[PDB]
Amino acid sequence: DKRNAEYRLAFEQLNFVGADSKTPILKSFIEDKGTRIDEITFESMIPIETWKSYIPQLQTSLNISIISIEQGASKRIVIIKSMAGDAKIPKYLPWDDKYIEEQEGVVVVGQTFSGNIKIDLNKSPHILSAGETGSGKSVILRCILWQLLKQGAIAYMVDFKGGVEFGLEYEKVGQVITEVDAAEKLFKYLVDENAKRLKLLRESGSKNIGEYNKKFEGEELKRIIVVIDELAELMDKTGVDDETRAKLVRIEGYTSTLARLSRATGINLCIGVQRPDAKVITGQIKNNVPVRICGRFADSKASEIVLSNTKAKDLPEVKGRFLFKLGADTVQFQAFYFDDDKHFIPNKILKLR
Ligand SMILES: OC[C@H]1O[C@@H](O)[C@H](O)[C@@H](O)[C@@H]1O
Ligand SMILES: OC[C@H]1O[C@@H](O)[C@H](O)[C@@H](O)[C@@H]1O
Ligand SMILES: OC[C@H]1O[C@@H](O)[C@H](O)[C@@H](O)[C@@H]1O
């Protein structure tokens, strides 16, 4: 076997042997095909602290990037989490307007092993982006927003922290909703706008708003993008009073209806979540929000709430490194770093008269 012959030679060149004079024994090599992260298990008498001292050398000899080395069941077992030197993705990928797609409704979120990650909002209409504060979870949503604003979409932005996440420059290109009263008015409007669009599709025999628009020269329905900076501000009802709770229940009813029924109507939800919790990322959100973007979470439960697998615990500690899940596959990718100070140019959008 190639791998066993390759490891043996590598260990012998280092005289990397235990008290019994044996080089480490390969017990198992488990590759994750989507993330390209491997679990290599070795048996030897070499202490874990010695393996850790050898990390720089083992990376070079075996041609791998070592994420971690941990002791297994016994002091004879080491488990290495690694990525092959061939599984290359950037560690920094600045946004650039050259990535903007010609096809309306198609957005790019970053780079994977073979090509870029593209999302066609006409096929997978809603996105949930989850990550710890500073991960880049929110940066991705603003990058998607910019792309859609450049394709002529209408935007609505929700931020209950006084709108500090969507400053005055965002207000030039759309409406910023900063409190629960304005959010009830917004979501009741979007649910009615969705109902009016479904009515137009049935009546005209149109599959989507794109087919509808071609039928009427002077009647052009535009894509609507709704960016929710933090889903917990709309879903977490724990400490509010009776009236605010009923208002949030009404809003949740509107969000659920929107997510489930806005597939063909060109109304897209881009949701941010800082702390995954089953009360916030419910079964209704999961059943109707197909795109998941997940940052690193050391906790298994947090990854299962977002992805319904534990792979977010395996990611390397790289800023802007995420998991992408659409359907049954989970892949690792580097997200674009979109910086408002240099990438968000409101006058370019306003010029699209
Ligand atoms: O990389 C292969 C496997 O390694 C294991 O350590 C992880 O828990 C799995 O999520 C992963 O699929
Ligand atoms: O469809 C465009 C891209 O997005 C996803 O379907 C996959 O994760 C990528 O491998 C693909 O290149
Ligand atoms: O926030 C709700 C309001 O949003 C505006 O953008 C729409 O034009 C109004 O019709 C709607 O009532």
mmCIF file of C-alpha atoms and ligand atoms in Angstrom:
data_model
loop_
_atom_site.group_PDB
_atom_site.id
_atom_site.type_symbol
_atom_site.label_atom_id
_atom_site.label_comp_id
_atom_site.label_asym_id
_atom_site.label_seq_id
_atom_site.Cartn_x
_atom_site.Cartn_y
_atom_site.Cartn_z
ATOM 1 C CA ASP A 1 0.000 0.000 0.000
ATOM 2 C CA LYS A 2 1.260 3.485 -1.110
ATOM 3 C CA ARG A 3 0.235 5.405 2.065
ATOM 4 C CA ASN A 4 1.784 2.868 4.532
ATOM 5 C CA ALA A 5 5.024 2.742 2.461
ATOM 6 C CA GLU A 6 5.056 6.581 2.306
ATOM 7 C CA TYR A 7 4.490 7.020 6.097
ATOM 8 C CA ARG A 8 7.062 4.359 6.984
ATOM 9 C CA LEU A 9 9.772 6.049 4.849
ATOM 10 C CA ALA A 10 8.898 9.505 6.255
ATOM 11 C CA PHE A 11 9.136 8.299 9.903
ATOM 12 C CA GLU A 12 12.399 6.334 9.333
ATOM 13 C CA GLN A 13 14.096 9.417 7.649
ATOM 14 C CA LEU A 14 13.312 11.235 10.999
ATOM 15 C CA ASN A 15 14.205 8.204 13.210
ATOM 16 C CA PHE A 16 10.772 8.940 14.720
ATOM 17 C CA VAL A 17 10.581 5.733 16.864
ATOM 18 C CA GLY A 18 9.236 4.882 20.359
ATOM 19 C CA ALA A 19 11.034 2.989 23.213
ATOM 20 C CA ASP A 20 10.205 -0.295 21.334
ATOM 21 C CA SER A 21 12.175 1.158 18.295
ATOM 22 C CA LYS A 22 9.041 1.097 16.067
ATOM 23 C CA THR A 23 7.894 3.912 13.770
ATOM 24 C CA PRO A 24 4.165 4.867 14.186
ATOM 25 C CA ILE A 25 1.574 2.367 12.936
ATOM 26 C CA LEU A 26 -1.244 3.672 10.674
ATOM 27 C CA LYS A 27 -4.501 2.486 12.325
ATOM 28 C CA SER A 28 -6.886 4.462 10.066
ATOM 29 C CA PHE A 29 -7.088 7.246 7.487
ATOM 30 C CA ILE A 30 -10.657 8.766 7.301
ATOM 31 C CA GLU A 31 -11.056 11.460 4.609
ATOM 32 C CA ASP A 32 -14.049 13.909 4.591
ATOM 33 C CA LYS A 33 -14.777 14.247 0.837
ATOM 34 C CA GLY A 34 -16.643 17.585 1.109
ATOM 35 C CA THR A 35 -14.402 19.430 3.628
ATOM 36 C CA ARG A 36 -11.145 17.676 2.524
ATOM 37 C CA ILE A 37 -10.195 17.320 6.235
ATOM 38 C CA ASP A 38 -8.610 13.923 7.142
ATOM 39 C CA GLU A 39 -8.462 12.010 10.440
ATOM 40 C CA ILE A 40 -5.182 10.056 10.654
ATOM 41 C CA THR A 41 -4.832 7.658 13.569
ATOM 42 C CA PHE A 42 -1.419 6.337 14.611
ATOM 43 C CA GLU A 43 -0.316 3.847 17.206
ATOM 44 C CA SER A 44 3.142 4.285 18.837
ATOM 45 C CA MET A 45 5.026 4.677 22.128
ATOM 46 C CA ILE A 46 6.016 8.313 21.256
ATOM 47 C CA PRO A 47 4.503 10.830 23.748
ATOM 48 C CA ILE A 48 1.947 13.398 22.441
ATOM 49 C CA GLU A 49 4.298 16.320 23.439
ATOM 50 C CA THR A 50 7.008 14.830 21.167
ATOM 51 C CA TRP A 51 4.458 14.539 18.226
ATOM 52 C CA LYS A 52 3.578 18.221 18.936
ATOM 53 C CA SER A 53 7.266 19.240 18.765
ATOM 54 C CA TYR A 54 7.433 17.446 15.409
ATOM 55 C CA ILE A 55 4.387 19.253 13.844
ATOM 56 C CA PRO A 56 6.478 21.639 11.615
ATOM 57 C CA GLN A 57 8.534 18.612 10.346
ATOM 58 C CA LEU A 58 5.573 16.185 9.870
ATOM 59 C CA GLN A 59 3.744 18.820 7.813
ATOM 60 C CA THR A 60 6.735 18.956 5.420
ATOM 61 C CA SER A 61 7.557 15.191 5.382
ATOM 62 C CA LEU A 62 3.887 14.133 4.911
ATOM 63 C CA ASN A 63 2.927 17.275 2.848
ATOM 64 C CA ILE A 64 -0.069 18.183 5.066
ATOM 65 C CA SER A 65 -1.382 21.166 7.066
ATOM 66 C CA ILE A 66 -1.973 19.910 10.589
ATOM 67 C CA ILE A 67 -5.108 21.390 12.209
ATOM 68 C CA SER A 68 -4.603 19.490 15.524
ATOM 69 C CA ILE A 69 -2.990 16.465 17.209
ATOM 70 C CA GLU A 70 -4.890 14.789 20.078
ATOM 71 C CA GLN A 71 -4.339 11.751 22.319
ATOM 72 C CA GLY A 72 -6.859 8.963 21.560
ATOM 73 C CA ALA A 73 -8.243 6.212 23.890
ATOM 74 C CA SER A 74 -4.755 5.391 25.286
ATOM 75 C CA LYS A 75 -1.355 7.090 25.533
ATOM 76 C CA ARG A 76 -0.381 4.796 22.553
ATOM 77 C CA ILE A 77 -2.928 6.483 20.193
ATOM 78 C CA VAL A 78 -2.592 9.853 18.429
ATOM 79 C CA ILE A 79 -5.241 11.378 16.184
ATOM 80 C CA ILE A 80 -4.203 14.031 13.660
ATOM 81 C CA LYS A 81 -6.731 16.340 11.962
ATOM 82 C CA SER A 82 -5.138 17.535 8.716
ATOM 83 C CA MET A 83 -5.567 18.742 5.117
ATOM 84 C CA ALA A 84 -3.382 17.537 2.202
ATOM 85 C CA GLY A 85 -1.021 20.161 0.689
ATOM 86 C CA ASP A 86 -3.047 19.528 -2.564
ATOM 87 C CA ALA A 87 -6.341 20.739 -0.893
ATOM 88 C CA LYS A 88 -5.601 24.437 -1.469
ATOM 89 C CA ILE A 89 -7.985 27.347 -0.669
ATOM 90 C CA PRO A 90 -6.973 30.960 0.187
ATOM 91 C CA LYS A 91 -6.607 32.206 3.786
ATOM 92 C CA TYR A 92 -7.623 35.716 2.603
ATOM 93 C CA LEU A 93 -9.824 36.526 -0.374
ATOM 94 C CA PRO A 94 -10.739 40.219 -0.767
ATOM 95 C CA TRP A 95 -13.991 41.053 -2.554
ATOM 96 C CA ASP A 96 -13.678 42.476 -6.087
ATOM 97 C CA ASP A 97 -16.468 43.720 -8.430
ATOM 98 C CA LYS A 98 -15.033 41.344 -11.157
ATOM 99 C CA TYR A 99 -16.851 38.426 -9.380
ATOM 100 C CA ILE A 100 -20.327 40.002 -9.982
ATOM 101 C CA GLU A 101 -22.384 37.592 -12.142
ATOM 102 C CA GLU A 102 -24.137 38.647 -15.341
ATOM 103 C CA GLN A 103 -27.043 36.306 -14.557
ATOM 104 C CA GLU A 104 -29.629 38.138 -12.369
ATOM 105 C CA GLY A 105 -30.188 36.339 -9.033
ATOM 106 C CA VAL A 106 -26.813 34.537 -9.118
ATOM 107 C CA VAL A 107 -24.404 35.484 -6.306
ATOM 108 C CA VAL A 108 -20.812 34.374 -5.465
ATOM 109 C CA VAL A 109 -19.839 33.877 -1.777
ATOM 110 C CA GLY A 110 -16.163 32.802 -2.043
ATOM 111 C CA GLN A 111 -13.651 30.125 -3.081
ATOM 112 C CA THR A 112 -13.650 26.338 -2.670
ATOM 113 C CA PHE A 113 -11.083 23.653 -3.894
ATOM 114 C CA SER A 114 -12.361 23.541 -7.523
ATOM 115 C CA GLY A 115 -13.865 26.942 -8.408
ATOM 116 C CA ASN A 116 -16.043 29.490 -6.605
ATOM 117 C CA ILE A 117 -19.209 28.932 -4.626
ATOM 118 C CA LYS A 118 -22.253 30.277 -6.581
ATOM 119 C CA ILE A 119 -25.824 30.519 -5.301
ATOM 120 C CA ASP A 120 -28.728 30.895 -7.793
ATOM 121 C CA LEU A 121 -31.470 32.599 -5.754
ATOM 122 C CA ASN A 122 -34.078 31.445 -8.378
ATOM 123 C CA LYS A 123 -33.326 27.797 -7.244
ATOM 124 C CA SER A 124 -32.341 28.165 -3.525
ATOM 125 C CA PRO A 125 -34.051 31.415 -2.454
ATOM 126 C CA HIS A 126 -32.975 31.820 1.210
ATOM 127 C CA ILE A 127 -29.623 31.851 3.019
ATOM 128 C CA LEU A 128 -28.719 31.400 6.675
ATOM 129 C CA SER A 129 -25.201 32.520 7.704
ATOM 130 C CA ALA A 130 -24.047 31.385 11.157
ATOM 131 C CA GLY A 131 -20.886 32.248 13.055
ATOM 132 C CA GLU A 132 -19.311 33.683 16.240
ATOM 133 C CA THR A 133 -18.836 37.469 16.460
ATOM 134 C CA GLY A 134 -15.861 38.500 14.236
ATOM 135 C CA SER A 135 -16.065 35.267 12.101
ATOM 136 C CA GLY A 136 -17.169 37.089 8.936
ATOM 137 C CA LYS A 137 -20.752 35.640 9.084
ATOM 138 C CA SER A 138 -22.222 39.194 8.703
ATOM 139 C CA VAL A 139 -19.624 40.323 6.074
ATOM 140 C CA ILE A 140 -20.917 37.499 3.718
ATOM 141 C CA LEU A 141 -24.508 38.825 3.955
ATOM 142 C CA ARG A 142 -23.380 42.418 3.041
ATOM 143 C CA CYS A 143 -21.340 40.961 0.085
ATOM 144 C CA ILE A 144 -24.502 39.122 -1.175
ATOM 145 C CA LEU A 145 -26.523 42.376 -0.629
ATOM 146 C CA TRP A 146 -23.990 44.425 -2.686
ATOM 147 C CA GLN A 147 -24.173 41.914 -5.594
ATOM 148 C CA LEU A 148 -28.000 42.051 -5.650
ATOM 149 C CA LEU A 149 -28.045 45.892 -5.324
ATOM 150 C CA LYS A 150 -25.690 45.907 -8.411
ATOM 151 C CA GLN A 151 -28.244 43.695 -10.276
ATOM 152 C CA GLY A 152 -31.015 46.194 -9.487
ATOM 153 C CA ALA A 153 -32.695 44.522 -6.464
ATOM 154 C CA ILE A 154 -34.775 46.431 -3.823
ATOM 155 C CA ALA A 155 -33.375 46.033 -0.280
ATOM 156 C CA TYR A 156 -34.739 45.891 3.256
ATOM 157 C CA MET A 157 -32.367 45.631 6.201
ATOM 158 C CA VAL A 158 -33.291 44.632 9.729
ATOM 159 C CA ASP A 159 -31.129 45.553 12.750
ATOM 160 C CA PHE A 160 -32.632 46.076 16.227
ATOM 161 C CA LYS A 161 -29.333 47.457 17.579
ATOM 162 C CA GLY A 162 -30.429 50.968 16.518
ATOM 163 C CA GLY A 163 -29.386 50.104 12.945
ATOM 164 C CA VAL A 164 -25.665 50.520 13.856
ATOM 165 C CA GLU A 165 -24.886 47.470 11.627
ATOM 166 C CA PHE A 166 -26.548 49.286 8.624
ATOM 167 C CA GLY A 167 -25.324 52.867 8.796
ATOM 168 C CA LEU A 168 -26.406 55.989 6.901
ATOM 169 C CA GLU A 169 -24.737 54.829 3.660
ATOM 170 C CA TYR A 170 -27.062 51.708 3.634
ATOM 171 C CA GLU A 171 -30.030 54.062 4.046
ATOM 172 C CA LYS A 172 -29.162 55.655 0.653
ATOM 173 C CA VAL A 173 -29.883 52.295 -1.135
ATOM 174 C CA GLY A 174 -32.785 50.888 0.928
ATOM 175 C CA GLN A 175 -34.816 50.920 4.115
ATOM 176 C CA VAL A 176 -33.252 50.106 7.498
ATOM 177 C CA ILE A 177 -35.722 48.749 10.122
ATOM 178 C CA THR A 178 -34.368 49.273 13.678
ATOM 179 C CA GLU A 179 -37.312 48.352 15.968
ATOM 180 C CA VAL A 180 -40.033 45.673 16.358
ATOM 181 C CA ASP A 181 -42.942 48.046 15.352
ATOM 182 C CA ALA A 182 -41.281 48.889 11.994
ATOM 183 C CA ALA A 183 -40.468 45.105 11.555
ATOM 184 C CA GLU A 184 -44.175 44.102 12.028
ATOM 185 C CA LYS A 185 -45.146 46.694 9.328
ATOM 186 C CA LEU A 186 -42.296 45.418 7.079
ATOM 187 C CA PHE A 187 -43.072 41.695 7.333
ATOM 188 C CA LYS A 188 -46.853 42.216 6.910
ATOM 189 C CA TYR A 189 -46.034 44.257 3.744
ATOM 190 C CA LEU A 190 -43.615 41.525 2.388
ATOM 191 C CA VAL A 191 -46.169 38.732 3.051
ATOM 192 C CA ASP A 192 -48.869 40.776 1.165
ATOM 193 C CA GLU A 193 -46.350 41.609 -1.656
ATOM 194 C CA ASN A 194 -45.554 37.864 -1.871
ATOM 195 C CA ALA A 195 -49.345 37.041 -2.025
ATOM 196 C CA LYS A 196 -49.812 39.633 -4.869
ATOM 197 C CA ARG A 197 -46.858 38.082 -6.816
ATOM 198 C CA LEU A 198 -48.192 34.497 -6.407
ATOM 199 C CA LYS A 199 -51.577 35.791 -7.747
ATOM 200 C CA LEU A 200 -49.797 37.338 -10.820
ATOM 201 C CA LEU A 201 -47.939 34.014 -11.476
ATOM 202 C CA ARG A 202 -51.128 31.862 -11.309
ATOM 203 C CA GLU A 203 -53.165 34.285 -13.464
ATOM 204 C CA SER A 204 -50.491 34.687 -16.187
ATOM 205 C CA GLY A 205 -49.412 31.012 -16.180
ATOM 206 C CA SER A 206 -45.862 32.126 -15.258
ATOM 207 C CA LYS A 207 -43.282 29.936 -13.478
ATOM 208 C CA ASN A 208 -41.507 32.898 -11.829
ATOM 209 C CA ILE A 209 -41.374 36.736 -11.842
ATOM 210 C CA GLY A 210 -38.790 36.569 -14.697
ATOM 211 C CA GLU A 211 -41.335 34.827 -16.993
ATOM 212 C CA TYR A 212 -44.064 37.244 -15.771
ATOM 213 C CA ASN A 213 -41.883 40.357 -16.534
ATOM 214 C CA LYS A 214 -41.355 39.269 -20.191
ATOM 215 C CA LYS A 215 -45.177 39.193 -20.673
ATOM 216 C CA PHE A 216 -45.719 42.893 -19.722
ATOM 217 C CA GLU A 217 -43.358 45.639 -21.000
ATOM 218 C CA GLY A 218 -44.373 48.342 -18.459
ATOM 219 C CA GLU A 219 -44.851 46.004 -15.445
ATOM 220 C CA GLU A 220 -41.459 44.961 -14.028
ATOM 221 C CA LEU A 221 -41.458 43.273 -10.625
ATOM 222 C CA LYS A 222 -38.049 43.615 -9.002
ATOM 223 C CA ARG A 223 -36.172 41.124 -6.804
ATOM 224 C CA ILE A 224 -36.573 42.048 -3.100
ATOM 225 C CA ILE A 225 -33.657 41.206 -0.713
ATOM 226 C CA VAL A 226 -34.359 41.137 3.037
ATOM 227 C CA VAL A 227 -31.261 41.096 5.234
ATOM 228 C CA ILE A 228 -31.817 40.107 8.846
ATOM 229 C CA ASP A 229 -28.609 40.883 10.757
ATOM 230 C CA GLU A 230 -29.620 38.734 13.736
ATOM 231 C CA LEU A 231 -32.404 36.126 13.702
ATOM 232 C CA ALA A 232 -32.447 36.014 17.581
ATOM 233 C CA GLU A 233 -33.892 39.627 17.591
ATOM 234 C CA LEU A 234 -37.036 38.256 15.792
ATOM 235 C CA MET A 235 -37.128 34.629 17.140
ATOM 236 C CA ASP A 236 -35.861 34.752 20.758
ATOM 237 C CA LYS A 237 -38.975 35.666 22.820
ATOM 238 C CA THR A 238 -37.702 34.587 26.333
ATOM 239 C CA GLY A 239 -37.539 37.907 28.320
ATOM 240 C CA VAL A 240 -40.074 40.213 26.577
ATOM 241 C CA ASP A 241 -43.588 41.148 27.887
ATOM 242 C CA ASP A 242 -46.980 39.731 26.672
ATOM 243 C CA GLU A 243 -47.602 42.385 23.978
ATOM 244 C CA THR A 244 -44.046 42.245 22.526
ATOM 245 C CA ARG A 245 -44.246 38.401 22.541
ATOM 246 C CA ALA A 246 -47.549 38.413 20.532
ATOM 247 C CA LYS A 247 -45.947 40.931 18.100
ATOM 248 C CA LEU A 248 -42.863 38.587 17.667
ATOM 249 C CA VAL A 249 -45.251 35.574 17.221
ATOM 250 C CA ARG A 250 -47.070 37.563 14.460
ATOM 251 C CA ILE A 251 -43.679 38.442 12.808
ATOM 252 C CA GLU A 252 -42.545 34.734 13.041
ATOM 253 C CA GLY A 253 -45.842 33.770 11.308
ATOM 254 C CA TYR A 254 -44.986 36.271 8.532
ATOM 255 C CA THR A 255 -41.308 35.104 8.217
ATOM 256 C CA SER A 256 -42.372 31.405 8.054
ATOM 257 C CA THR A 257 -45.019 32.105 5.345
ATOM 258 C CA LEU A 258 -42.446 34.184 3.417
ATOM 259 C CA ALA A 259 -39.735 31.483 3.619
ATOM 260 C CA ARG A 260 -42.099 28.657 2.585
ATOM 261 C CA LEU A 261 -43.960 30.482 -0.251
ATOM 262 C CA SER A 262 -41.479 32.987 -1.843
ATOM 263 C CA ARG A 263 -39.540 30.470 -4.047
ATOM 264 C CA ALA A 264 -40.830 31.860 -7.421
ATOM 265 C CA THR A 265 -41.707 35.471 -6.404
ATOM 266 C CA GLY A 266 -38.165 36.909 -6.148
ATOM 267 C CA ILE A 267 -38.325 37.779 -2.427
ATOM 268 C CA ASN A 268 -35.093 36.530 -0.746
ATOM 269 C CA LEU A 269 -34.220 36.217 2.962
ATOM 270 C CA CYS A 270 -30.526 36.554 4.017
ATOM 271 C CA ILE A 271 -30.366 35.670 7.708
ATOM 272 C CA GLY A 272 -27.497 36.056 10.177
ATOM 273 C CA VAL A 273 -27.261 33.997 13.403
ATOM 274 C CA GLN A 274 -24.555 34.502 16.032
ATOM 275 C CA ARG A 275 -25.556 31.786 18.539
ATOM 276 C CA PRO A 276 -27.373 28.735 17.050
ATOM 277 C CA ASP A 277 -30.244 27.667 19.326
ATOM 278 C CA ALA A 278 -33.224 25.401 18.380
ATOM 279 C CA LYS A 279 -35.637 28.135 19.582
ATOM 280 C CA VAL A 280 -34.159 30.559 16.985
ATOM 281 C CA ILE A 281 -33.177 28.179 14.123
ATOM 282 C CA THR A 282 -36.461 26.228 14.328
ATOM 283 C CA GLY A 283 -37.623 23.285 12.158
ATOM 284 C CA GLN A 284 -39.661 25.722 10.017
ATOM 285 C CA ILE A 285 -36.512 27.843 9.293
ATOM 286 C CA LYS A 286 -34.563 24.638 8.514
ATOM 287 C CA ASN A 287 -37.280 23.170 6.250
ATOM 288 C CA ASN A 288 -37.500 26.391 4.174
ATOM 289 C CA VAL A 289 -33.996 27.945 4.244
ATOM 290 C CA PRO A 290 -31.889 25.692 1.947
ATOM 291 C CA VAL A 291 -28.497 27.491 1.878
ATOM 292 C CA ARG A 292 -26.412 27.220 5.072
ATOM 293 C CA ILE A 293 -23.165 29.030 5.602
ATOM 294 C CA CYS A 294 -21.564 27.966 8.899
ATOM 295 C CA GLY A 295 -18.475 29.269 10.690
ATOM 296 C CA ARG A 296 -16.386 27.350 13.197
ATOM 297 C CA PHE A 297 -18.178 26.260 16.419
ATOM 298 C CA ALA A 298 -16.253 23.960 18.863
ATOM 299 C CA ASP A 299 -19.646 22.756 20.239
ATOM 300 C CA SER A 300 -21.234 19.766 18.369
ATOM 301 C CA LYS A 301 -24.850 20.865 19.164
ATOM 302 C CA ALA A 302 -24.317 24.370 17.568
ATOM 303 C CA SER A 303 -23.075 22.710 14.302
ATOM 304 C CA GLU A 304 -26.084 20.217 14.324
ATOM 305 C CA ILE A 305 -28.600 23.075 14.730
ATOM 306 C CA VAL A 306 -27.150 24.837 11.593
ATOM 307 C CA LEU A 307 -26.032 21.887 9.367
ATOM 308 C CA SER A 308 -27.620 18.755 10.967
ATOM 309 C CA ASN A 309 -24.004 17.340 11.179
ATOM 310 C CA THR A 310 -21.026 18.125 13.533
ATOM 311 C CA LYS A 311 -18.524 19.320 10.832
ATOM 312 C CA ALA A 312 -18.297 22.997 12.020
ATOM 313 C CA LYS A 313 -16.130 21.678 14.947
ATOM 314 C CA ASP A 314 -13.471 20.404 12.410
ATOM 315 C CA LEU A 315 -12.777 23.675 10.576
ATOM 316 C CA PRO A 316 -9.248 25.186 10.882
ATOM 317 C CA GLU A 317 -8.992 28.500 12.840
ATOM 318 C CA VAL A 318 -8.761 30.745 9.737
ATOM 319 C CA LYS A 319 -10.729 34.022 9.544
ATOM 320 C CA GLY A 320 -13.379 33.872 6.805
ATOM 321 C CA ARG A 321 -13.189 30.061 6.515
ATOM 322 C CA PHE A 322 -16.662 28.493 6.403
ATOM 323 C CA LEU A 323 -18.760 25.439 5.611
ATOM 324 C CA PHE A 324 -21.319 25.670 2.784
ATOM 325 C CA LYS A 325 -24.290 23.297 2.801
ATOM 326 C CA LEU A 326 -26.980 23.159 0.029
ATOM 327 C CA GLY A 327 -28.805 19.862 -0.052
ATOM 328 C CA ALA A 328 -26.987 16.828 1.363
ATOM 329 C CA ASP A 329 -23.306 17.957 0.791
ATOM 330 C CA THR A 330 -21.132 20.140 3.109
ATOM 331 C CA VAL A 331 -18.034 21.761 1.572
ATOM 332 C CA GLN A 332 -15.277 23.965 2.998
ATOM 333 C CA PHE A 333 -14.701 27.387 1.360
ATOM 334 C CA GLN A 334 -13.022 30.786 1.963
ATOM 335 C CA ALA A 335 -15.563 33.610 2.087
ATOM 336 C CA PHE A 336 -14.899 36.978 0.440
ATOM 337 C CA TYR A 337 -13.863 39.709 2.831
ATOM 338 C CA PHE A 338 -16.182 42.586 1.921
ATOM 339 C CA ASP A 339 -15.201 45.767 3.735
ATOM 340 C CA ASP A 340 -17.887 48.523 3.800
ATOM 341 C CA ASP A 341 -15.169 51.254 3.939
ATOM 342 C CA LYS A 342 -13.749 50.248 0.549
ATOM 343 C CA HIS A 343 -16.326 48.027 -1.202
ATOM 344 C CA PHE A 344 -19.761 49.572 -0.491
ATOM 345 C CA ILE A 345 -20.136 52.503 -2.940
ATOM 346 C CA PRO A 346 -23.728 53.846 -2.725
ATOM 347 C CA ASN A 347 -23.383 56.208 -5.745
ATOM 348 C CA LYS A 348 -22.760 53.227 -8.111
ATOM 349 C CA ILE A 349 -26.237 51.836 -7.075
ATOM 350 C CA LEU A 350 -28.073 55.195 -7.299
ATOM 351 C CA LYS A 351 -26.626 55.638 -10.863
ATOM 352 C CA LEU A 352 -28.605 52.407 -11.784
ATOM 353 C CA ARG A 353 -31.659 54.721 -12.298
HETATM 354 O O1 LIG B 1 -12.306 13.975 8.578
HETATM 355 C C1 LIG B 1 -13.090 12.792 8.697
HETATM 356 C C2 LIG B 1 -13.961 12.828 9.932
HETATM 357 O O2 LIG B 1 -13.083 13.114 11.029
HETATM 358 C C3 LIG B 1 -13.720 13.078 12.301
HETATM 359 O O3 LIG B 1 -12.785 13.358 13.285
HETATM 360 C C4 LIG B 1 -14.812 14.141 12.356
HETATM 361 O O4 LIG B 1 -15.469 14.045 13.614
HETATM 362 C C5 LIG B 1 -15.798 13.966 11.203
HETATM 363 O O5 LIG B 1 -16.702 15.068 11.176
HETATM 364 C C6 LIG B 1 -15.064 13.883 9.868
HETATM 365 O O6 LIG B 1 -15.968 13.595 8.801
HETATM 366 O O1 LIG B 2 -23.245 25.488 -8.087
HETATM 367 C C1 LIG B 2 -22.075 26.297 -7.996
HETATM 368 C C2 LIG B 2 -21.159 25.933 -6.842
HETATM 369 O O2 LIG B 2 -21.957 25.840 -5.643
HETATM 370 C C3 LIG B 2 -22.330 24.540 -5.138
HETATM 371 O O3 LIG B 2 -23.248 23.886 -5.944
HETATM 372 C C4 LIG B 2 -21.108 23.637 -4.922
HETATM 373 O O4 LIG B 2 -20.812 23.550 -3.532
HETATM 374 C C5 LIG B 2 -19.900 24.131 -5.706
HETATM 375 O O5 LIG B 2 -18.952 23.081 -5.869
HETATM 376 C C6 LIG B 2 -20.348 24.661 -7.063
HETATM 377 O O6 LIG B 2 -19.230 24.945 -7.903
HETATM 378 O O1 LIG B 3 -41.973 49.163 5.674
HETATM 379 C C1 LIG B 3 -43.164 48.941 4.934
HETATM 380 C C2 LIG B 3 -43.227 49.849 3.729
HETATM 381 O O2 LIG B 3 -42.035 49.606 2.960
HETATM 382 C C3 LIG B 3 -41.911 50.439 1.806
HETATM 383 O O3 LIG B 3 -40.711 50.193 1.154
HETATM 384 C C4 LIG B 3 -43.083 50.179 0.864
HETATM 385 O O4 LIG B 3 -42.986 51.003 -0.292
HETATM 386 C C5 LIG B 3 -44.390 50.452 1.598
HETATM 387 O O5 LIG B 3 -45.496 50.181 0.746
HETATM 388 C C6 LIG B 3 -44.462 49.607 2.864
HETATM 389 O O6 LIG B 3 -45.628 49.921 3.617
#
